[PDB]
Amino acid sequence: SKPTLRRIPRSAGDEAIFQVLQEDGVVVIEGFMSADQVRRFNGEIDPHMKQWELGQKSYQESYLAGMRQLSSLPLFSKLFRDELMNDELLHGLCKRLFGPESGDYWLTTSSVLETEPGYHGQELHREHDGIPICTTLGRQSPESMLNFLTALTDFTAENGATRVLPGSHLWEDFSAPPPKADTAIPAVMNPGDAVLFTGKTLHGAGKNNTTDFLRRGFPLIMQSCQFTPVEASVALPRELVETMTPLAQKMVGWRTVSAKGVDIWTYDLKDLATGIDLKSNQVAKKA
Amino acid sequence: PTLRRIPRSAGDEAIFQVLQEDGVVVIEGFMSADQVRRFNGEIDPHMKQWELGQKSYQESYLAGMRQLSSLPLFSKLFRDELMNDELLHGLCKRLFGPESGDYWLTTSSVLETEPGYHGQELHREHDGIPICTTLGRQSPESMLNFLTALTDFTAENGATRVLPGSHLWEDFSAPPPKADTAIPAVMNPGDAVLFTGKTLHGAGKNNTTDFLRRGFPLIMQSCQFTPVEASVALPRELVETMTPLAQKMVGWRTVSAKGVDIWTYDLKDLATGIDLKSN
Ligand SMILES: O=C(O)CCC(=O)C(=O)O
Ligand SMILES: O=C(O)CCC(=O)C(=O)O
Ligand SMILES: O=C(O)CCC(=O)C(=O)O
Ligand SMILES: [Fe+2]
Ligand SMILES: [Fe+2]
Ligand SMILES: [Zn+2]
Ligand SMILES: [Zn+2]
Ligand SMILES: [Zn+2]
Ligand SMILES: [Zn+2]
């Protein structure tokens, strides 16, 4: 069935957005971030960007070679820590996706991904293939990941807009070789618009056919708390973590999370934040 | 059926075979007498009662016990001897290598049951992970429990009870039998009862008037699953005293999930990115 990529404003709310996500596996959120947020986030991000270093021999390297990438963005962005990790729409959607089979959720990875002119694109893939039990289960897998992929520049068919196959989250055989990326639908989007897809939906970065345009995307992937994050929370200094809200702290791997009633990521099997005396919403004063 | 026993010297292949067939095996002399003495010496002064009011899966099974967890924080012998043990690593490589790749520590505790302690209901350890509860028998291997006796383990004093073969039963959601139908792992100090997360087991009833029965569960887990014990509780200073391999077990290095690097810094190697020292 030759399907369509649907588009829905941020103001429609999480119920309406979640419904298209269930039916299609992917939806465009218009105005996920405002223009002002995109400007400020870009300002914070610019000076830390660089090329992906080859020689890793990993799953990451197979899909991320040729891209400019920065990850562990809690370390580099106040707007990430304070605005995005407390966003009510993000949390409403995560509660609906992950609540039934997993309970709690948290950040697995977030990156800024900039594709240069001539970048050839990715093969279509499902994001849940980073987790081996989900690869084994295929369609029968529980929901494990949710990717909020925000456009930080214009996203066009020509400049490499992320390509998606609506409905692929419901195909019978997830191990079948995926189709060519050019049969998929590019998520044409203005800055601040985000393409939202589960870890079960076939997608990939498009070919950048321009001569002079750097196409900047912002994947932010939330994950079921029972699965180990791609990005380690031990990289964050305690001092920085203590500037965030309790909820943001929990997303970045410094609080206890409940896996269907099972407390995990604990200190002495009890609450983590209590055990280590973790502070929150700290604000350093000019003194 | 019977609970089988194999000496530590027989090696990982022989031990792994009984584990596949029975889901549970006694390793004679997993730790030496001298290790048990020294480990006990280190552990003694930090023990306390489980605090109620947690409203968790942990609390449902651990109420009434004395417990200490996050044992890398309290024991040099844990950090240096146990986290580098060749037999532990040989068995984990065999259990987890096929479906998961790497593995690491999820939880380890000292569990002391007092006289009168009523025992646990029989349970499978993989029910701490929701996807494994859903899959039941069809679940991939997720956990391996090396449960070492730190005092004598007797039928009467609450030796851990196990049902050999329960890892192969068709229906994992069927209500388990009474704990007193299961076989107690009678053991000397340093012997360990080894079982997968799919095998029905539980701490026994302590029917003595005067014996404190001290067990030492050490649970390794497939790296794709979040640990029960958080690695952010460990200060960096302490982690840097351990070997690279021990560091990896306690959640401070990158682990490979069937070729997928996870627990990374900037998607690259964690230890490199944060400049992590060792030994
Ligand atoms: O059209 C359908 O319902 C799916 C059929 C199909 O692709 C299959 O099961 O092989
Ligand atoms: O950056 C994009 O457009 C897609 C990235 C992606 O799908 C991935 O790297 O897993
Ligand atoms: O300490 C014992 O004997 C068994 C403990 C146990 O099975 C558990 O707490 O999961
Ligand atoms: Fe992807
Ligand atoms: Fe248990
Ligand atoms: Zn609503
Ligand atoms: Zn079919
Ligand atoms: Zn738009
Ligand atoms: Zn051998």
Numbering used by the authors:
A (entry chain A): 7 to 293
B (entry chain B): 9 to 287
Any passages from the paper?
EasH from Aspergillus japonicus (Aj_EasH) is a recently discovered enzyme involved in the biosynthesis of the natural product cycloclavine 4.1,2 This compound is a member of the ergot alkaloids, a fungal-derived class of natural products with a wide range of biological activities and pharmaceutical applications. Aj_EasH is a non-heme iron, α-keto-glutarate (aKG) dependent oxidase that works together with a flavoenzyme (EasA) and an NADPH-dependent oxidoreductase (EasG). Aj_EasH catalyzes a highly unusual ring rearrangement to form the 5-3 ring system of the ergot alkaloid cycloclavine 4.
Numerous efforts to soak or co-crystallize Aj_EasH with substrate (chanoclavine-I aldehyde 1) or product (cycloclavine 4) did not result in the observation of a ternary complex. The aKG appeared to be coordinated to the iron as would be expected for a catalytically competent orientation. The iron in Aj_EasH is coordinated by H131, E133, H209, in a similar fashion to AsqJ (H134, D136, H211) and Cp_EasH (H141, D143, H217). Within this loop there is a short helical segment (residues 52–72), which we refer to as the “lid”. Our X-ray structure reveals that the likely substrate binding pocket of Aj_EasH is spacious and largely hydrophobic (the pocket is delimited by Tyr65, Tyr69, Val236, Thr115, Leu119, Leu275, Leu70, Ile227 and Gly136) and, based on the relatively high B factors for the lid (residues 52–72), most probably highly plastic.
